[PDB]
Nucleic acid binder design. Structure first.
Lengths: 56, 62, 99, 97, 42
RNA sequence: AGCUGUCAACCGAGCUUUGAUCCGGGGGUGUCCGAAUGGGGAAACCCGGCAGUCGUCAUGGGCUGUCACCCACUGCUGAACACAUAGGCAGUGUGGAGGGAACGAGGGGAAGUGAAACAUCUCAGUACCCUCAGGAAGAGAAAACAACCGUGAUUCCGGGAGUAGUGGCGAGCGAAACCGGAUGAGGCCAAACCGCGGGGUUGUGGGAUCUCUCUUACGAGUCAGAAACCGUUGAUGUAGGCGAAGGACAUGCGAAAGGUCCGGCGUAGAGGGUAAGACCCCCGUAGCUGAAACAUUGACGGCUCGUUUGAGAGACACCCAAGUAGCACGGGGCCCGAGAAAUCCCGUGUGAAUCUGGCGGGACCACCCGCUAAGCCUAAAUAUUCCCUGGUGACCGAUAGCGGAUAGUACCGUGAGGGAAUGGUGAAAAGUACCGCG
């Protein structure tokens, strides 16, 4: 869970060659970053999309 | 009840004392076996209930 | 309960038809009344313990008011009427008079 | 004084106890009362002193469990009670009768 | 007509538009009001 | 004109025409536990702080208020460190916490079973679980359909149709266009530009900015397009009132509502009781009638709000929702099981344009047609009954009907949990005085 944009993990199926379905999970690429919110130093879990966009 | 409403605050506080004291004596008489009119216990309790009601009514200004 | 306490009534359907009598006590919740003279039962009571004869209640719909009209007596049903101050007064219907 | 901050000692003293043991205790100037279960020995002492204007020496309290009783339908339990035995100073007495 | 006749024990009342087979067969006689008769036939 | 609930009789003692009991509306009290919330705890127990107050020589002890955490805001202080923040202190909040029969939206998500085996598939997005609600929810004002003709927000019902399709093309699954119906409604912002306010709201494209031409009181409201309250009054609700008309004779056994004869009311012959089948004995029904009080909901007045220059022509290419659309990979859902796979949703990388912009019309290209995504709000048709009022049954009638003619009780289990059996004297107790054996 990105603390900025609310991007959460997605759920789906992992499919084999035999086409057997099992449950897996796409977790977003969330990196722990030290940031300054309101002049105060704080550590956040942020997704690289927010980093790339400059939201932090 | 109407007859009570004409009493002052102190008079109402008083009347509560005698009401409480009277019930006290009736309870003792009943326990010791000398009570004759069982209905009095109920009667005095209702008077006791009235006096609080009027005292509270004055406090809240109803 | 139209049948008040202390009225003159007539048993219209029972072991003792005809007999008039006063209304001793009325039970307006179970719809029964006591008419002195009718259904006089003999209770076997023990200890002065012995046979005692007192009247048992009869159903209210088995009696009916007696109003006096032109000499002799006549049984009547009862209606109501306001006078001027919204006061219902038992009004006889056989005669139209005020009971 | 108001109608919420009003307290009368006669509420603590529910009633006296009449019994052979209580009668035997009268001769020793120990009076047994049934008191409000929420009262403590200190309240009992103050209540008796104010109600009867007597000098209380000691107060003992007995907590008695209600007696379970059988009925047609099943089992009921009488009320629990708290009994206080008040020992008075020499020469002081209470007329409970 | 409705209020006058509805209380009679033996009389069953109907609108012209809701005349129905069951009521006709049960009833010994059928009585129309002239307004009803023309409304039904039309 | 009686009354003191019921099992449930009984005694005793009382209240009551100076209006009781009973019924409806409002108000006061409301111990302790429980979100439990001063601290603690084996729920209904234990121990306190602070302020006030009663009491005593005084401690001890009573009584009232108040004190959890998180969040919102106002102020004081500001660490290591210097700004400074973190943090700490103070002040307030009708802010949150938990409960609830069914119904709803969004997520997670089985297996028994079927396939006469079984793994793709089915069961099934069911059971169950998680977050959030409301009286309904969700959806909803076209980046939509259609096919060159045209319809014009959404929802729900009957078709289209078990059809086109889909499928170890197995077991199975299964639309849409369009047609007939229920209800009917449209509003507002972001952006550019100007100083949180103005501005503007678009698909025939519109808006900004600049130049030119002409011109220069009124409406809407308790709602989705803002939001309350004060009063006057209308209706409905929560107690009620009135409300027609039958007698005689005999029988019966014990009681007439049944028999015989004569009658009556009927805007009332629904139903229930009354000592056996009652329109006229009672309760009622048809039909009218009623509210100090408070609730629901209208109308009006006060009240509140919105608007008070506008239109056309020409310029200009300034704006029209970005880590988004698209594309690559891995997945989900759609009739469609990844296939040539469109549209829709998710994660990872890469990654535009602004009207010559962009999207769809089932790979893809061109033309043509429709429409403006990356913002929001929205009643009505629709689902449900824990509960309340009034009714119905070719539904049950005590091994039936709810498990329960009250019981989630007795009993069983450590516990989640399982869980019964027992209705009927008579019209009225008149429930057998008295005598005798014991």
């Amino acid at each position: 869970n990105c603390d900025v944009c609310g991007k959460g993990p997605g759920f789906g199926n992992n499919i084999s060659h035999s086409h057997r379905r099992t449950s897996r999970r796409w977790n977003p690429n969330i990196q722990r970053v030290r940031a300054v919110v309101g002049r105060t130093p704080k550590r956040l879990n942020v997704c690289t999309s927010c980093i790339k966009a400059g939201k932090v | 009840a109407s007859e009570l409403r004409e009493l002052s605050n102190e008079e109402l506080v008083g009347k509560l004392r005698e009401a409480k004291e009277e019930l006290f004596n009736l309870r003792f008489q009943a326990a010791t076996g000398q009570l004759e009119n069982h209905g009095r216990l109920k009667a005095v309790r209702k008077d006791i209930a009235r006096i609080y009601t009027l005292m509270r009514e004055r406090e809240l200004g109803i | 309960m139209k049948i008040k306490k202390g009225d003159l009534v007539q048993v219209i359907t029972g072991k003792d038809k005809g007999k008039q009598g006063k209304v001793i006590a009325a039970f307006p919740r179970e719809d029964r009344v006591l008419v002195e003279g009718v259904n006089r039962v003999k209770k076997h009571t023990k200890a002065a313990g012995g046979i005692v004869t007192v009247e048992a209640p009869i159903h209210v719909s088995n009696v009916q008011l007696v109003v006096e009209k032109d000499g002799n007596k006549v049984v009547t049903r009862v209606g109501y009427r306001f006078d001027e101050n919204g006061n219902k007064i038992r009004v006889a219907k056989r005669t139209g008079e005020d009971i | 004084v108001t109608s919420k901050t009003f307290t009368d000692p006669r509420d603590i003293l529910v009633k006296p106890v009449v019994s052979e043991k209580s009668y035997a205790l009268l001769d020793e100037n120990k009076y047994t009362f049934v008191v409000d279960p929420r009262a403590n020995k200190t309240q009992i002492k103050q209540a008796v002193e104010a109600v009867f204007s007597v000098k209380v020496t000691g107060v003992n309290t007995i907590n008695r469990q209600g007696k379970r009783k059988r009925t047609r339908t099943g089992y009921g339990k009488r009320a629990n009670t708290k009994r206080a035995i008040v020992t008075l100073a020499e020469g002081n007495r209470i007329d409970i009768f | 007509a409705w209020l006058s006749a509805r209380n009679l024990p033996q009389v069953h009342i109907l609108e012209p538009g809701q005349l129905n087979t069951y009521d006709v067969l049960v009833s010994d006689d059928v009585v129309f009001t002239k307004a009803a008769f023309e409304s039904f036939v039309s």
